[PDB]
Amino acid sequence: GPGMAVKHLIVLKFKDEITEAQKEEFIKTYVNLVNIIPAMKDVYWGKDVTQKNKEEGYTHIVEVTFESVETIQDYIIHPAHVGFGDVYRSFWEKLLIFDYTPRK
Ligand X SMILES: CCCCCCCc1cc(O)cc(O)c1C(=O)O
Q: Which residues contribute to the annotated binding site for Mg(2+)? A: 34, 37, 40
Distance (Å) of CA 34 to CA 9, 16, 18, 78: 15, 28, 24, 12
40 CB-contact burial (10 Å; exposed 0-12 / middle 13-18 / buried 19+): buried
Determine which one of 30, 58, 75, 81 is catalytic. Answer: 75
Provide, rounded to whole angstroms, the least separation between the CB of residue 2 and ligand X: 25
The answer to whether the beta carbons of residues 90 and 15 sit under 8 Å apart is: yes
Nearer to ligand X, 27 or 34 (CB): 27
Provide, rounded to whole angstroms, the least separation between the CB of residue 78 and a copy of itself: 16
Distance (Å) of CA 67 to CA 4, 74, 87: 8, 11, 27
- Residues at the binding site are 8, 34, 37, 40, 75
Name the CA radius of gyration of the chain, rounded: 14
List the single partner that 85 binds among ligand X, a copy of itself, none, CB under 5 to 8 Å by kind.
ligand X
Q: Does 7 bind a copy of itself (CB under 8 A)?
A: yes
**Which position among 50, 77, 86, 89 is part of the footprint of a copy of itself (CB under 8 A)?**
50
Q: Which residues are catalytic?
A: 75, 78
